[PDB]
């Protein structure tokens with residue numbers, strides 16, 4: 001529908017689901033497994049940025065194997081790099097994403113607790129492979145008819161690099177704004193696992209009220225919203241911010257008191273709010289880690305370290321495809337998708 005969707009013989013009966021930039025997603029029938037599946041068309045070979053997000057995601061999703069992470073069952077493309085204009089990614093078909101649910105459905109504490117658990121169970125695996133998602137948000141969280149959750153879209157995911165994390169004040173950033181951590185606008189490049197935890201916390205706050213917690217309308221407004229609820233950062237939290245332009249801005253701000261979680265979330269579970277507090281901690285070094293998040297009393301009826309697997313092996317270092325030209329990426333996208341062609 002709309003435009004060309006050439007998913008070959010093995011997939012039939014196309015139904016539009018949704019799209020976006022350099023992509024488009026339909027549902028089809030897998031004749032080999034007799035089950036309906038989701039397929040996403042990708043046309044990234046235009047400029048490097050698309051190719052870059054497409055290579056990462058294919059490279060990661062293909063090495064990752066986890067119940068709460070979306071997998072790639074199949075990849076359809078042309079037999080030659082010279083004929084390849086599009087690439088099709090076959091993935092599990094899910095009923096919906098968390099973004100849609102929050103629009104019309106009120107979640108029970110049980111649903112909130114289970115959804116939270118699956119997010120962290122999957123995030124733990126991701127960080128085990130030394131990888132950051134870096135764009136966690138409701139729309140990147142898929143649910144099926146029995147409320148099984150799968151994290152998707154690793155287009156902004158990078159290998160963790162905490163040693164080269166520092167940067168100047170008000171540094172431009174690409175991930176979704178409502179879920180950007182405080183330090184992003186202050187002095188962080190986003191190469192620390194503490195980036196993801198913050199977003200999860202934003203997500204946990206949004207699940208409690210069906211509203212985004214920090215809905216900034218622009219870059220610096222995002223920091224205002226956060227400071228408006230957590231209140232002024234303490235002296236010790238302020239001493240960790242060594243960058244002067246960053247520290248002075250915070251200093252130039254009038255003293256603001258923190259708003260009690262139970263003031264914002266009246267009918268929320270106390271154990272939930274306590275964990276929310278740990279996740280939405282201003283100081284990234286103090287912010288609770290994922291494996292602590294699971295061991296938290298709130299997730300007590302699900303927590304089981306033996307049933308929450310980690311990666312067999314991480315990614316050695318940051319993927320160097322950062323300054324790699326359009327041509328080499330297409331070649332790499334081509335080489336990464338080879339295992340799915342019949343002549344292989």
Ligand SMILES: O=C(NCc1ccccc1)c1cc(-c2n[nH]cc2-c2cccc(Cl)c2)c[nH]1
Pocket residue numbers: 017018019020021022023024025038039040091092093094095096097142152153
């Ligand atoms: O990768 C995915 N989404 C992220 C994304 C990035 C760029 C462009 C489009 C989608 C994705 C979603 C799904 C999916 N499975 N079942 C339902 C979906 C789905 C739900 C809501 C919206 C879409 Cl567009 C797709 C499979 N892959």
